[PDB]
Amino acid sequence: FTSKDTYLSHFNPRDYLEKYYSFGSRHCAENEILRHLLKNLFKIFCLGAVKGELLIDIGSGPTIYQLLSACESFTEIIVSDYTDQNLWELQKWLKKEPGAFDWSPVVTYVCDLEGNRMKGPEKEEKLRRAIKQVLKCDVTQSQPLGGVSLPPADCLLSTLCLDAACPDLPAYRTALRNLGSLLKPGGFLVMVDALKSSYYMIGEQKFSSLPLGWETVRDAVEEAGYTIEQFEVISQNYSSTTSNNEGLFSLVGRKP
Ligand SMILES: Nc1ncnc2c1ncn2[C@@H]1O[C@H](CSCC[C@H](N)C(=O)O)[C@@H](O)[C@H]1O
Ligand SMILES: COC1=CC=C(C(N)=O)CN1C
């Protein structure tokens, strides 16, 4: 199983973004998954009771797509990742640097989803404004943010991270417990991840995944104490040879 060290030495943020999040003419399977992810996140953050002051995103990588609807419902956002170069790629975009990844097509799509009450540049400004901190994190640690003093979060978000970070089910359960240390009683856990995937690719670079069915995900989350408020299966697959996933899931849990 892919180690933490392999992420540091092999994960190329710009390549990752180009292959999965360009929302262009190529990578059509990847485009379809992204549309569905954005639809589910819109419903989770804009149509429900998932709102509050502070949201902490765990394992953000170099991406912001998972935060676009969230910033309508949360005033403060903290993003975090294990991999230093991912955080720097994120910063390129936050600081509006030349050469930052083009998120426009994604931003436009979310604006469309939210009824066009807002144009692209306004949405991008609002997200930049909401993101308060960009921090190192390690989900495998009892104190995932290195024990920095932060208020307990109203929402804990993690997309496409836990399957990649956990070599087996005991490790997956431990990571779930670890994340809970950051969340208020009554707070929301929002999770997205691949189903039944044992790997994903960034070009030639292969990264491990823990293959889990939706029932197994449900049980692990429920055994961690969460009341599952929402759970959806996304029945789309990544491109052949890109992953062996059979769909993805999204879920909303509430901490007792
Ligand atoms: N032990 C760990 N703790 C926190 N993050 C980890 C981790 N091991 C791997 N990761 C991160 O998990 C991410 C998987 S790529 C997922 C990126 C983004 N959240 C998206 O939805 O596309 C990588 O950015 C990697 O750095
Ligand atoms: C697009 O990024 C990803 C795709 C599939 C993954 C998996 N666990 O199969 C993980 N992952 C980060």
Author numbering: 5 to 260
Direct quotes from the study:
Nicotinamide N-methyltransferase (NNMT) is a cytosolic enzyme that catalyzes the N-methylation of nicotinamide by transferring a methyl group from S-adenosyl-L-methionine (SAM) to nicotinamide (NA) resulting in the formation of 1-methyl-nicotinamide (MNA) and S-adenosyl-L-homocysteine (SAH). NNMT is implicated in various disease conditions such as metabolic disorders, neurodegenerative diseases and cancer, and tissue NNMT expression or plasma levels of its product MNA have been proposed as biomarkers for these conditions. Human and mouse NNMT proteins are very similar in size, consisting both of 264 amino acid residues. The biologically active unit is a monomer.
JBSNF-000088 inhibited human NNMT (hNNMT), monkey NNMT (mkNNMT), and mouse NNMT (mNNMT) enzymatic activities with IC50 values of 1.8, 2.8, and 5.0 µM, respectively. Based on these results, crystallization was carried out in the presence of JBSNF-000088 and SAM at molar ratios of enzyme:SAM:compound ~1:5:10 for human NNMT & at molar ratio of enzyme:SAM:compound ~1:10:20 for mouse NNMT. Co-crystals were obtained with JBSNF-000088 for both human and mouse NNMT enzymes and X-ray crystal structures were determined at 2.48 Å and 1.99 Å resolution in P21 and P212121 space group, respectively. JBSNF-000088 was found to be methylated in the human and mouse NNMT structures with the cofactor SAM correspondingly being demethylated to SAH. The binding environment of the methylated compound is very similar in human and mouse NNMT. The methylated product is bound below the hairpin structural motif at the nicotinamide pocket, and its pyridine ring stacks between Tyr-204 (from hairpin) and Leu-164. The amide moiety is recognized by two Ser residues from the hairpin (Ser-201 and Ser-213). In the binding site of mouse NNMT, a further interaction, though probably weaker, is observed between the amino group of the amide and Ser-247. The methyl group of methylated JBSNF-000088 is in close proximity (~3.4 Å) to the sulfur atom of SAH. Therefore, JBSNF-000088 may act as a competitive substrate analog that is very slowly converted to its N-methylated product.
